Design a protein around this ligand. Structure first.
Ligand SMILES: CN1CCCN(c2ccccc2CO)CC1
Length: 145
């Protein structure tokens, strides 16, 4: 299996699925390095973020648990097609990159926070992460290039 993937069993259904311990992605189908990648992200900050402040809120007070719940809800709506990633990032990302639909541009290893970097480079082009934790908060990462 490609880097980071492992087999798992659904508790509610008993069906096998695949989970990536670098990106926290999970999916039913069997999963299918460049100098640089390009990613977008949706950041949800929490009270223990390195800077608990954003363009949405002068004082971010939500707990890490609450931020994870919000991230999980956004992932559900993206996966169902009810909402697009770019739309949720523009409206609800606590990163200033919200104004660019979450786009961060292209980057190399050694530039981003390590959990973010590792998830970004383990995604295939077009793939989306699960919740990724950094000192900034909790991220949904979309690899675009
Ligand atoms: C990564 N950080 C430093 C760079 C500035 N950021 C940004 C802000 C507003 C629009 C676009 C971007 C990057 O695409 C993101 C924060």
């Amino acid at each position: 299996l490609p880097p980071g993937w492992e087999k798992a069993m659904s508790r509610s259904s008993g069906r096998v699925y695949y989970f990536n311990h670098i990106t926290n992605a999970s999916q039913w189908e069997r999963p299918s390095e460049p100098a640089r990648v390009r990613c977008s992200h949706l950041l949800v900050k929490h009270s223990q973020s390195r800077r608990p402040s954003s363009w949405r809120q002068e004082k971010i007070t939500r707990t890490k648990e609450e931020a994870l719940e919000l991230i999980n809800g956004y992932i559900q709506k993206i996966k169902s097609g009810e909402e697009d990633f770019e739309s949720l990032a523009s409206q609800f990302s606590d990163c200033s990159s919200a104004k660019a639909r979450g786009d961060l541009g292209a980057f190399s290893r050694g530039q981003m926070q390590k959990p973010f970097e590792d998830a970004s480079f383990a995604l295939r082009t077009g793939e989306m992460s699960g919740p990724v934790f950094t000192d900034s908060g909790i991220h949904i990462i979309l690899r675009t290039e």
